[PDB]
Design a protein around this nucleic acid. Structure first.
Ligand SMILES: [Mg+2]
Ligand SMILES: [Mg+2]
Ligand SMILES: [Mg+2]
Ligand SMILES: [Mg+2]
Ligand SMILES: [Mg+2]
Ligand SMILES: [Mg+2]
Ligand SMILES: [Mg+2]
Ligand SMILES: [Mg+2]
Ligand SMILES: [Mg+2]
Ligand SMILES: [Mg+2]
Ligand SMILES: [Mg+2]
Ligand SMILES: [Mg+2]
Ligand SMILES: [Mg+2]
Ligand SMILES: [Mg+2]
Ligand SMILES: [Mg+2]
Ligand SMILES: [Mg+2]
Ligand SMILES: [Mg+2]
Ligand SMILES: [Mg+2]
Ligand SMILES: [Mg+2]
Ligand SMILES: [Mg+2]
Ligand SMILES: [Mg+2]
Ligand SMILES: [Mg+2]
Ligand SMILES: [Mg+2]
Ligand SMILES: [Mg+2]
Ligand SMILES: [Mg+2]
Ligand SMILES: [Mg+2]
Ligand SMILES: [Mg+2]
Ligand SMILES: [Mg+2]
Ligand SMILES: [Mg+2]
Ligand SMILES: [Mg+2]
Ligand SMILES: [Mg+2]
Ligand SMILES: [Mg+2]
Ligand SMILES: [Mg+2]
Ligand SMILES: [Mg+2]
Ligand SMILES: [Mg+2]
Ligand SMILES: [Mg+2]
Ligand SMILES: [Mg+2]
Ligand SMILES: [Mg+2]
Ligand SMILES: [Mg+2]
Ligand SMILES: [Mg+2]
Ligand SMILES: [Mg+2]
Ligand SMILES: [Mg+2]
Ligand SMILES: [Mg+2]
Ligand SMILES: [Mg+2]
Lengths: 98, 53, 71, 171, 59, 94, 108
RNA sequence: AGGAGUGGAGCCUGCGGCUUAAUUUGACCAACACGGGAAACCUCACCCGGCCCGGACACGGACAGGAUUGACAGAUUGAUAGCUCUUUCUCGAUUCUGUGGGUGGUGGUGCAUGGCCGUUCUUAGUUGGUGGAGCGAUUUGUCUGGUUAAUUCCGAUAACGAACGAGACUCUGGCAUGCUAACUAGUUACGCGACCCCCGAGCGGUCGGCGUCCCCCAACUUCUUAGAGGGACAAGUGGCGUUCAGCCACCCGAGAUUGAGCAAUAACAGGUCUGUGAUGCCCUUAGAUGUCGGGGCUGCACGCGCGCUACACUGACUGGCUCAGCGUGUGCCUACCCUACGCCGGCAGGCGCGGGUAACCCGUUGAACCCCAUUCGUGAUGGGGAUCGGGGAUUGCAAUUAUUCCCCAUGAACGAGGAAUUCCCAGUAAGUGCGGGUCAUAAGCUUGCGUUGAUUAAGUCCCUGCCCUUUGUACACACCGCCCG
RNA sequence: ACACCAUGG
């Protein structure tokens, strides 16, 4: 039983509402630091994003013990299906960044 | 499962490791660098340590 | 860092004994239920989960570290 | 804390921050000509500037990439939301930034080209843009199973003394 | 600040060392003026990565 | 005394299952750092040394020593014959 | 023996070693005496002396002195000839003596 | 020519050998107090046991009377690991089975590599363009001679004009009564005020003498701080120099030769896969080479290296007196910093209340050797402090194979060290203590700082090597070569 | 006005 359903949701809603995630490469930090700190371990974030990456949907970078994960159009579509959202809403990033 | 997954690690070199390479041997702890003696020599110019002795 | 040698007992895990799904209630009549095992008076438990009929023991699988009755 | 960190730790921590940000942005904008960051802590805001050669690639489509970059830089270093502000910029006379030429040659070699042809092309470019001299070395298993090294020098070049802390760019 | 490290990884060779050092310069100015004028003058023309700290009562 | 307690619950309760005019069998353990409380007098214990539970019959003279101080972790050495590198007088082969 | 020879594969010694036994058409032997030209006189641990040749792989990399245990691979067609395949150290020779491999006529 | 030594003694620490379940391992001028390598757990790679998956993803299989998760009690186990066994509640599609495929590795190879470092090699060495010589490899330029620390210069000239290295350059030590300007630094003055003693004339007061006793919106920058400029150039004078480059001596002077950083072409099968989310290939991948408990890295007939303490009277002991400088200091994950002053205790140490994120508090850093007086008296002695018994504290989850510290007791070798051999030219050798690094605990190590402060040289090429020219060679894997009977 | 100075995984 890898993750309670509560946790898959609590990762995916954050990744969708922000459009990006960072996580220290730590498998023993008992709580993701402030993001997802409602009893979600750091281990679950990285194991979830691993699967999410192995199927596209995400791009990953790593520097000095920290993963950085970006979303993609395929990932936007998959998460819009998986969390049952209105077919046009995304709070992640929409502005003319002058 | 298990509830035996860590034993007390508050001190000693099992407690601490480099910011960069995550290795345990030859860390510099002065001024709060917390950085391996090899990793430092590599980034010391970015940090601001110049060599003019 | 050398290879492993033949063991004596090695065996991985139990096999999750396959009991029938749900036979915790019996009817005296349709709409007159009887309950063989008592429901656990616990606060964290929603008063819908049952107890083991473990004569000399009463074991609630939810509170997996306490609340066992010895008779 | 109620009394903030001391000056020594403060400056060391500033340096470590700048080094980590430069490493992160090096590992990412390589294919876009990343050539250095300039942290300018301004009134009411922390501004970061990224010089590069292909700025459209840095910001992307309507600025999706640049907003993602602001997002991660704000998530990882613990900044209060709304503080970190990021800008892209174009470097003038790219032929004199060593890091740009080093990464250009790295990708030109990663895509298939005679190593001598590539090195001589970058030597031509670097000397044509106006420069007292250049020197490009490539070390490794060039054409065989035993390693070697190939050095291409041009113009004037100094190795000793204090004038080397300036007057040279190394990558 | 001074840090003296071994020059080599791996512990082989003649035993040479590297001496890095950082230097921190500090100055202070004292004024007798209303605080508004202080915030007026102190927030202009700060080019380099110098710090500027203002404290309201030190005399 | 942590779960160094429970070892006292098997030191004791093993001297009552034992038939009189005899000794408890073996309460074998890894706990080398136990002090010897006077309760443990009389019982037999098997104190691990890294590979083996060497047995000890506790006597009233060991009161206040460490249980680890009664099973050694190595063999007392008897020497062989010095080999090829043992002196500078020795080097050469074809 | 010391030299300026830091070159070449530097150090091929370890405190670990694993045994190798006989195979099809492969016997043990004891070096009887040394000859020139890389040749050798030997003695199979049962019968013939079977003059041996130190193969291209062993030349100047693992030395063979007189009166030591060796493992040689016999030739099918010829009989009096063989090629030195492996050398057995003192501890491994005594180990073979313990496992009963070599008829205990030659000692270490 | 000398000084201090090392080699001899006891102990500390590293490497070999021996021993072992294992005593993990790299490295043999340029290994051996080196890998920051002072390992109780951790570290940790070794040995002996025991859980776990943290095996993405694709396909197929079983599956909502249902895949799958977790656990009470007795047995079992080092264990309160539902590890397994008896028993049967709980979770809910997240799994599980199988086939491919990934993943991790302080696993192998540094003779497959990147990078870094060391070394040849601390010396003065290196290179091309056009022109000249040669059939050519090659050569000249890059030099007979003088000079220099220097392929530094003068000159000579089939070469001309250039590049690197040297030098220049940066930090540092020595000087400014000139500038800039300072209760987070001071001086002097008196406003002072006060204590104290006559210690002086005097009375004791006035005048004085001591003050890290208290004040100043006093005046200033000599001492402190740190910025800008100045200042030394073989500039002046006398000799020696083809009167050139330069060398010796002297006046004036803070000084006429401080110390480091940086450093070339070409190369080495030098070291590092155990610094790395640097890395190719090979190996292993669920009975793991990816985690917890216990043991080891410390074991002792012996060989070797770097070192600490001594062999006493130019001393040991017990009191008294009086002087530093370079530093560090509250930690984000990580939970711990430097201490004043009161009390308590012989001592280590404990309790209680404050300051400091620091020119602000510890701190005017009352350091040691040295200085001044006692006792000892040439006796392995009151020199030396190994080894060992008994007791008391602190750090820690845990001190046994004594972590460290304190107290009473026991009181070994050692009376200046064989053949050999290391380092050193002036605030240097040596004596002496103090900080940083590692550090929950902790230096006989190393990296910096002051303090006291010599003898001997101003040379040479003998020994060990280095640079340049001429010469010889059967060498080129280059004399650690080749080669004859 | 000349002591000894052999050999090389
Ligand atoms: Mg130059
Ligand atoms: Mg120079
Ligand atoms: Mg001495
Ligand atoms: Mg000790
Ligand atoms: Mg050993
Ligand atoms: Mg040398
Ligand atoms: Mg220790
Ligand atoms: Mg260990
Ligand atoms: Mg791999
Ligand atoms: Mg690795
Ligand atoms: Mg190499
Ligand atoms: Mg290398
Ligand atoms: Mg020519
Ligand atoms: Mg010609
Ligand atoms: Mg020439
Ligand atoms: Mg000269
Ligand atoms: Mg000239
Ligand atoms: Mg010229
Ligand atoms: Mg003159
Ligand atoms: Mg004078
Ligand atoms: Mg100088
Ligand atoms: Mg050089
Ligand atoms: Mg490496
Ligand atoms: Mg590898
Ligand atoms: Mg290591
Ligand atoms: Mg682990
Ligand atoms: Mg362990
Ligand atoms: Mg060791
Ligand atoms: Mg040494
Ligand atoms: Mg002394
Ligand atoms: Mg010290
Ligand atoms: Mg400390
Ligand atoms: Mg210390
Ligand atoms: Mg050390
Ligand atoms: Mg010598
Ligand atoms: Mg010369
Ligand atoms: Mg010649
Ligand atoms: Mg030849
Ligand atoms: Mg010879
Ligand atoms: Mg011959
Ligand atoms: Mg000779
Ligand atoms: Mg011979
Ligand atoms: Mg011969
Ligand atoms: Mg030879």
């Amino acid at each position: 039983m890898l993750m309670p359903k509560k946790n898959r949701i609590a990762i995916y809603e954050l990744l969708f509402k922000e459009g990006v995630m960072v996580a220290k490469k730590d498998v023993h930090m008992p709580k993701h630091p402030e993001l997802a700190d409602k009893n979600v371990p750091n281990l679950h974030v990285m194991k979830a994003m691993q699967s999410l990456k192995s199927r596209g949907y995400v791009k990953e970078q790593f520097a000095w013990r920290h993963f950085y994960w970006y979303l993609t159009n395929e990932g936007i579509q998959y998460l819009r299906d998986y969390l049952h959202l209105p077919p046009e809403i995304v709070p992640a990033t929409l502005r003319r960044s002058r | 499962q298990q509830l035996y997954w860590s034993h007390p690690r508050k001190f000693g070199q099992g407690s601490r490791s480099c910011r960069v390479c995550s290795n345990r041997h030859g860390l510099i702890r002065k001024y709060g660098l917390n950085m391996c003696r090899q990793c430092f020599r590599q980034y010391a110019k970015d940090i601001g340590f110049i060599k003019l002795d | 860092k050398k290879s492993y040698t033949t063991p004596k007992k090695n065996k991985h895990k139990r096999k999750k004994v396959k009991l029938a799904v749900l036979k915790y209630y019996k009817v005296d009549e349709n709409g007159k239920i009887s309950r063989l095992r008592r429901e656990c008076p616990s606060d964290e438990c929603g008063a819908g989960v049952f107890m083991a009929s473990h004569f000399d023991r009463h074991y609630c699988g939810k509170c997996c570290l306490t609340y066992c009755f010895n008779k | 804390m109620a009394v903030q960190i001391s000056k020594k730790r403060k400056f060391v921590a500033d340096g470590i921050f700048k080094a980590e940000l430069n490493e992160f942005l090096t590992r990412e904008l390589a294919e876009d000509g990343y050539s250095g960051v300039e942290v300018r802590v301004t009134p009411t805001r922390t501004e970061i500037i990224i010089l590069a050669t292909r700025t459209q690639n840095v910001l992307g489509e309507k600025g999706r990439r640049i907003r993602e970059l602001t997002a991660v830089v704000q998530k990882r270093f613990g900044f209060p939301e709304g503080s970190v502000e990021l800008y892209a910029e174009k470097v003038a006379t790219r032929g004199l930034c060593a890091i740009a030429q080093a990464e250009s040659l790295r990708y030109k070699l990663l895509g298939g080209l005679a190593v001598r042809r590539a090195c001589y092309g970058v030597l031509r470019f670097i000397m044509e843009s106006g420069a007292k001299g250049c020197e490009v070395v490539v070390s490794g298993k060039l054409r065989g199973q035993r390693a070697k090294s190939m050095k291409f020098v041009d113009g004037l070049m100094i190795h000793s003394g204090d004038p080397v802390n300036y007057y040279v760019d190394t990558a | 600040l001074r840090i003296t490290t071994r020059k080599t990884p791996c512990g082989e060779g003649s035993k040479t060392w590297d001496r890095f050092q950082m230097r921190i310069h500090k100055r202070l100015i004292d004024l007798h003026s209303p605080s508004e004028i202080v915030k007026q003058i102190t927030s202009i023309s700060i080019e380099p990565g110098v710090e500027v700290e203002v404290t309201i009562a030190d005399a | 005394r942590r779960k160094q307690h429970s070892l006292l619950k098997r030191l004791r309760k093993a001297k009552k299952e034992a038939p009189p005019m005899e000794k408890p069998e073996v309460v074998k353990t890894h706990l080398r750092d136990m002090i010897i409380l006077p309760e443990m007098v009389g019982s037999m214990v098997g104190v691990y040394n890294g590979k083996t539970f060497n047995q000890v019959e506790i006597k009233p003279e060991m009161i206040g020593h460490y249980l680890g101080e009664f099973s050694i972790t190595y063999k007392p050495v008897k020497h062989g014959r010095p080999g090829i590198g043992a002196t500078h007088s020795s080097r050469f082969i074809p | 023996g010391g030299k300026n020879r830091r070159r070449g594969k530097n150090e091929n010694e370890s405190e670990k070693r694993e045994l190798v036994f006989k195979e099809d058409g492969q016997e043990y032997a004891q070096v009887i005496k040394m000859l020139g030209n890389g040749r050798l006189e030997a003695m199979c641990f049962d019968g013939v002396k079977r003059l041996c040749h130190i193969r291209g792989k062993l030349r100047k990399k693992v030395w063979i002195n007189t009166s030591d245990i060796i493992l040689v691979g016999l030739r099918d067609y010829q009989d009096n000839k063989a090629d030195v395949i492996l050398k057995y150290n003192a501890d491994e020779a005594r180990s073979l003596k313990a496992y009963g491999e070599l008829p205990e006529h030659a000692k270490i």
